[PDB]
Design a protein around this ligand. Structure first.
Ligand SMILES: CC(=O)O[C@H]1C[C@@]2(C)[C@@H](C[C@@H](O)[C@H]3[C@@]4(C)CC[C@@H](O)[C@@H](C)[C@@H]4CC[C@@]32C)/C1=C(\CCC=C(C)C)C(=O)O
Ligand SMILES: CC(=O)O[C@H]1C[C@@]2(C)[C@@H](C[C@@H](O)[C@H]3[C@@]4(C)CC[C@@H](O)[C@@H](C)[C@@H]4CC[C@@]32C)/C1=C(\CCC=C(C)C)C(=O)O
Lengths: 305, 305
């Protein structure tokens, strides 16, 4: 028992992290097979970042301008290309530590693990969610760009995020591994505000199921509700609307606990309308929304990799 | 910016996890050099667990009764011995993935990362603290025994915890890597209640410094206090008493932020007396106490490994 914000074991990704230096800029890259992926803004100076023309800046760069270092050993760069907002550096050596992997573009509300890195060296690992406004609430300092987010299905690493920027509000923006930003953000130091950070309703419900499984039940009540009735409440509290797809995804937690999804919605409704009255749920004094239904089943069952 | 409950990268420990089977019991072991460490209750049947005589039970076991499997390959056991509550299984092969390591016995209030494992396979990583009552609030299912807790200082893994048991209240008990339990617990299925789970005052103060560094400042007030005055408040709220040693350890966060330690104590005092009035600090609606002063400096600076 016990329920924790749990990251995937990071070893398979640690073996892929390298340092990329272009001119005087250094950040992290991801070495898979014979390609190193990194943010294209590695080619920018401090000056360039206000409105860079990446295609023009890249004309001035050759393979030998990209210094790639894997631990203590230098990699030989034999080609380079820009794909959307990432650079792909072809090296002459396949990473012998390459895990089975895929590139995935996740949906808002999905969770993943981040391996924060500096100078190609891993610093820590933590769990995040793609927020509905397509930011993530990470922990990133200068030098952390190129750190990646990922999920692991047994032996396969699904890479879903590469870190590019911190917005003025302290939240984080980045791309998938094809270099397309999540949300409307651009790799330019300009005014870009984040939209409404709505709460991921299906995740809160999953976490309430986790609470019940782990002994925290005081929030269970005598009520039920309907999808439409619940969603009038969700709207008022800036919660995502709940759909039948969400209900279906919660089925297995319903089955394990014997608590119908709409009954649990009625408990969440009461929690939204009345607050938690100084009580806690799984060690938290607010409603946690960065556990997916899959996350709860995985942690409460013990799937390994 | 941003502040997250962050675990150490787990790769160095993943390479040490093995499966140990004695008879029909299977749990996890830690393979360092040519020794495998695991909980001695691997030799117990379900029956034996009420009051086992481990020395008598071990008489019936030989080297070949301990099946040790590292991934897909079997290890040859060439000796075995009991040290306190752990077994040490000597194998004929040194683990080629052994990191530089030490064994450390941590103090209550210190934090560490746990690599939850099942059948020798890592499942996830998360950050915990040794509570003042010498339990930890983990996430452990049946089969997770032998999973370990650790810190990493650059290249050196300091192992501090091996998981042995879940208490009836859902919290967790275990040993250092010399096999001595933290707290008064025993590897016996009997009545053992946990003591008062007091809050780790110096950690809360560190986390408040982290909040200030990361933009959350609404809890700063116009007041100061004294150690003795603050501790009258700490006592009332089941907080650990604050000592000058604690004050000294917070010096660097004081210096970075320009907020004197006793001023921050006065802010915490007001938070304890008045609550947070529906506000949040670093994404939390309660006062977090599982970040040490060192944890805050590390995350807010970017130390790597
Ligand atoms: C190594 C390092 O510290 O670089 C950091 C620090 C960085 C050079 C930043 C890019 C850009 O803001 C930079 C300028 C010159 C932008 C213009 C002004 O505002 C300056 C006051 C500011 C100082 C440095 C800073 C803040 C970096 C980034 C790039 C982030 C990506 C984008 C698209 C902004 C990085 O993390 O690589
Ligand atoms: C693989 C597995 O499921 O074993 C788990 C499950 C386990 C065999 C447990 C040890 C002990 O409680 C067991 C008994 C027989 C204890 C006596 C009764 O209460 C039973 C209702 C109970 C059922 C199984 C259980 C709960 C295990 C432990 C050992 C934990 C260590 C101690 C000292 C208790 C383990 O995790 O290895």
């Amino acid at each position: 028992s016990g329920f924790r914000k749990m990251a995937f074991p990071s070893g398979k990704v640690e073996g892929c992290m390298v340092q990329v230096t272009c001119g005087t800029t250094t950040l992290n890259g991801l070495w898979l097979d014979d390609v190193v992926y990194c943010p294209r803004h590695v080619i920018c100076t401090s000056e360039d970042m206000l409105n860079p023309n990446y295609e023009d800046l890249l004309i001035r760069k050759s393979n030998h301008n990209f210094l790639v270092q894997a631990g203590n050993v230098q990699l030989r760069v034999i080609g380079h290309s820009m794909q959307n907002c990432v650079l792909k550096l072809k090296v002459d050596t396949a990473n012998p530590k390459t895990p089975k992997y895929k590139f995935v573009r996740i949906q808002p509300g999905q969770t993943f693990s981040v391996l924060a890195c500096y100078n190609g060296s891993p610093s820590g690992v933590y769990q995040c969610a793609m927020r509905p406004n397509f930011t993530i609430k990470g922990s990133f300092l200068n030098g952390s760009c190129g750190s990646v987010g990922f999920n692991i299905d047994y032996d396969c690493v699904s890479f879903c995020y590469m870190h590019h920027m911190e917005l003025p509000t302290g939240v984080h923006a980045g791309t998938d591994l094809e270099g397309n930003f999540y949300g409307p953000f651009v790799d330019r130091q300009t005014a870009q505000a984040a939209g409404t950070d709505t709460t991921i309703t299906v995740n809160v419900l999953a976490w309430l199921y986790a609470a019940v499984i782990n002994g925290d039940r005081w929030f269970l009540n005598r009520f039920t509700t309907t999808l439409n009735d619940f969603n009038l409440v969700a709207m008022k509290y800036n919660y995502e609307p709940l759909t039948q797809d969400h209900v279906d995804i919660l089925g297995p937690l319903s089955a394990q606990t014997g608590i119908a999804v709409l009954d649990m919605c009625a408990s969440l409704k009461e929690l939204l309308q009345n607050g938690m009255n100084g009580r806690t749920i799984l060690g938290s004094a607010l409603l946690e929304d960065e556990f997916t239904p899959f996350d709860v089943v995985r942690q409460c069952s013990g799937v390994t990799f």
